[model samples]
Target: SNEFWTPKRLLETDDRIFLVVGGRGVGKTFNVTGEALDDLFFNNVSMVYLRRLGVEIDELEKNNFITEEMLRVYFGNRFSDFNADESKQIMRFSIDGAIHEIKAIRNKIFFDDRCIVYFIALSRAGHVKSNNYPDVKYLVFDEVIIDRSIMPNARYIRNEFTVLLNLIETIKRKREDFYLFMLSNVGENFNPIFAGLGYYLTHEDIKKGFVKREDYCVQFVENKQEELNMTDPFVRLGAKNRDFSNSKTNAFENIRTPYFKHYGKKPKLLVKYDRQYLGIAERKIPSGLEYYYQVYKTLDGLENITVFNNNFDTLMEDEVFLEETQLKKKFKTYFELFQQNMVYHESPETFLEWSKFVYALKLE
Candidate 1:
């Protein structure tokens, strides 16, 4: 059903690096990857599709995922340059007058041999090295956080995020206006990839439908049922409350009350709540030891950190302005907070400050 394309999914095509989070069947992966596939398949664009090692196009095509049939059905006759060979496992297409060249072949995909997007195991840190690819405009990481079968450890996922950054950097060095897309169901607090992206939902953010971070955007599609038909299986699940009642399910649902309380066709979406740590803070702290202060900066190009202690204190008045690095050295106690990656800030600014401090320290 075209009903599967929720509003949140449309954000994938936007010109930004996307960190997409949704509940079990909110269609995060389907839509994000679908948009990428459609854009490359129909438009004159180049992108690298990456999944964990051992994942192949056939596996992706399983469960009636993306296929020639599906694309044919969706695009109808609008696709002019459409030609895919299943046996050879290569699909080639282009826009009206645009030409897309397959420079290398890997895992059956053309133009790019490293098309199979897999990362070196996280446990083997030394093996994590640069993954050089052709100058494609888009990079897609499917199930980046939830793909437990491939890389189960959160540490590996974290390493993969770094790997992706490098990949994007490499692409940017050669091309302009590239995109990095990550699709996943909301994962646990320990999901290092999600934790590193640092753009998650709060109750307030979810209720608002999506969150716009500095460099990336997080769209939470917890309640797609309102847009689905009553006979839809997802709607039926909400009625049963059978599959949707898991503690994890409840984490993303925005509706505070029961489904029936809302009346009408009680088609519930994903959870309303999330583990706070999963959505906020820098890292997992000892439960009892609360953060005393957070030293952070903004992108508007002002020096000195804006410190906010958990004890309801703002260190703005105590500020003796200094470069971020010098400030950290001057304030030894607060330096620990920065070391822990607890720089309290929001996007664009967070990214800039993060690059300045973390990269300068050479602490991956």
Candidate 2:
């Protein structure tokens, strides 16, 4: 049965370089970051939770159930008797009088004693070099590829990702058994890091498994109504129904309504626009005029989907093309032409640039 699939189980068992992409309300952060805390403190491990800034340590503690405040909030009377040093830079908790301290220095958190989990930031290159956590079992990079960050230019994003990848390599070299996890909402497919791992563009690809460039294990978990139904009540009933001012749908509603309907309940994790009926390009489709037609198939809602032959001029006048107004602008003429033409003109530098722009559009 698929009943036992939890983030905790996935983390515990999988020992590869884990890359997971999940939607907003699937507890992606809660499971990857939050449950990592549970795994470290409660189950015991030497790990580091990395972010963009040091203050994010407090942010992590505030949002997650791994801290004493959360433990008390959920456990209530049972944890009321236990006192915590809340005011200090380092928060200390006594579990059966065995002292465990969560110390913060800049963008890092050190759990001294049983495990050393450092929440360090990579806001700058110097930050990466200065607070290097060696000999840790696990390293987590959270939400590294954001939409706005990648949209402006592809070169900058590629360079940023290259540096991060080098840092990860250094960490892996330091310890053979070291595990690295990059967790994020399904972002741009061309985000250098994700592209470096390989393309995970289609719903089928996510269903089968994420693309792996070499030795890495990339896992994509899509949000499904059935999966939510199988999960706890908190997930089933929460978030999707909440009120957000001036918004047509809440997080859960977005997933449940359009996504569920379009993807037929078992759809893979995709961005809001993809689920919102915008026919954007899929990642895995080979670059060419064929790829453009594949995208057109999605937009036109055509059945018996297939690649366009060289005699493609005949297909342009099909009813699907005439049905929609402003379809030409929607396809973005020059942009589409460039992408398809670039398929045959592969170069390392051009590929990097292309990937960045493509991934950026997926989100932005």
Candidate 3:
């Protein structure tokens, strides 16, 4: 029976590398960043390495404001006297508790070995220098491929995907049991790397036994959209239901949004005319697009029934979910009522609801 996934299962596996991807908020950043913190404070890990392009580092050190603020929140009073010099491309932060300084690489920063975060910013002239940093145990990249950042004209956005490939190759050559974690949102792609590891994406694939395997990489949606709409129908039923973020359909805003409305009417028209002059180009679909589409399709409706997963909604209905996260007799009571109210051969929507109840119940 399928059950609620536990985080321990993911963190305990022997696989040295894990690539976790999620939409805007399936808790990808929270999970990965939290794991980094865990490695520092709990696991007693000597060093946790994080790789990002240099451009991101620049944005983080914009002012004494952002630097000090980030330190206070993440590192407490451990750091102060933050400075930035874009010309030399250097940023320095010192902590009250330490003799070693915190160094920033572009948008990346190195936290203390005790706190275990190292920054490696890929550059055309740069590569991994430490082939034998004994303290370095895991390399975690929160978001691996930022396609928009990789434009040819962009300063730090180089076509250095190959550089990352070689970086991993070098790490493996060391004969160490290190781990790698790469995460990103939907639009960003990491098929090449996952394929290299022989990982297949699965929402609910028959490879049930494979999920617990270290080398297996399963991709599943957390169903945040459905949960939101089910919890508050207004998100899907209100006048502007689908426009919660205003960019829900495309998931990104271009120059056309209200935020970019400052451009004058004449200039906007000129930009439009220039765009018309550029002819459309036919682009071939990438190889893994089909796999991604299938994964998304399986995840589409899973969240819609989560509202009943709790007690608040179950009491309102004649019967609702059979699962109770708590250990109580109400769970059995709910299951009895649910079975009594069951209607066979109902429409897809109704059948799915029953199946959702059964699925939720199995978790108990």
Candidate structures ordered by TM-score, highest first? 2, 1, 3
Backbone clashes in candidate 2 total: 4
lDDT tens readout by residue for model 3, 1-364:
1113223455676565555544453355444444454455445453433446655444534222123444445565565667657455444666564444444444334444232555555552155655644455566565554434334342223334445666656544554656666654433212233323434333233223234345544443332334455457665465354444433322122211111011111110000111121011112347421100000112133333222224443344332442434514534543343333322222233223333333233322
Candidate 3 lDDT for residue 141:
60
lDDT of 2 by residue, 1-364 (tens): 1122245545556456777665552255544544455456665456666665444455665312245654443334544344445556656555545656666554445567443556555545455564355556677777655443323442333245556666666555556666777776544443457555654344455557555545666566555444345367765456466432212122112121111111111111111122222122333435632221112214333333322221223334332332123323443553454433433222333334444444434222
* Model 1 lDDT per residue over 1-364, tens place: 3424443454444547766556553354455445565555544455655664433343544323444554554556654576665565555655344544332233234333334232322233234344344445666666565544334552243245566566566545656667776666543332345546664334666667667767777666553434446668876666677544343354443321111111121111111111101011223357733222212223132233232221112223543334445534544443344444444433432333333333233322
Q: Which stretches of candidate 3 lie over 4 Å from their true place?
A: 1-7, 42-52, 61-115, 123-125, 145-162, 169-177, 187-191, 198-216, 226-364
Per-model CA lDDT versus the true structure: 0.44, 0.46, 0.39
lDDT of 1 at 337: 45
Q: Pairs clashing in candidate 3? A: 16-179, 56-107, 57-106, 57-107, 58-106, 78-95
Predicted structure with the largest lDDT when compared to the true one:
2
RMSD of each: 13.0, 14.0, 23.4
TM-score of every model versus the real structure: 0.51, 0.53, 0.42
Q: Against the true structure, whose TM-score is highest?
A: 2
Model 3 score (lDDT): 0.39
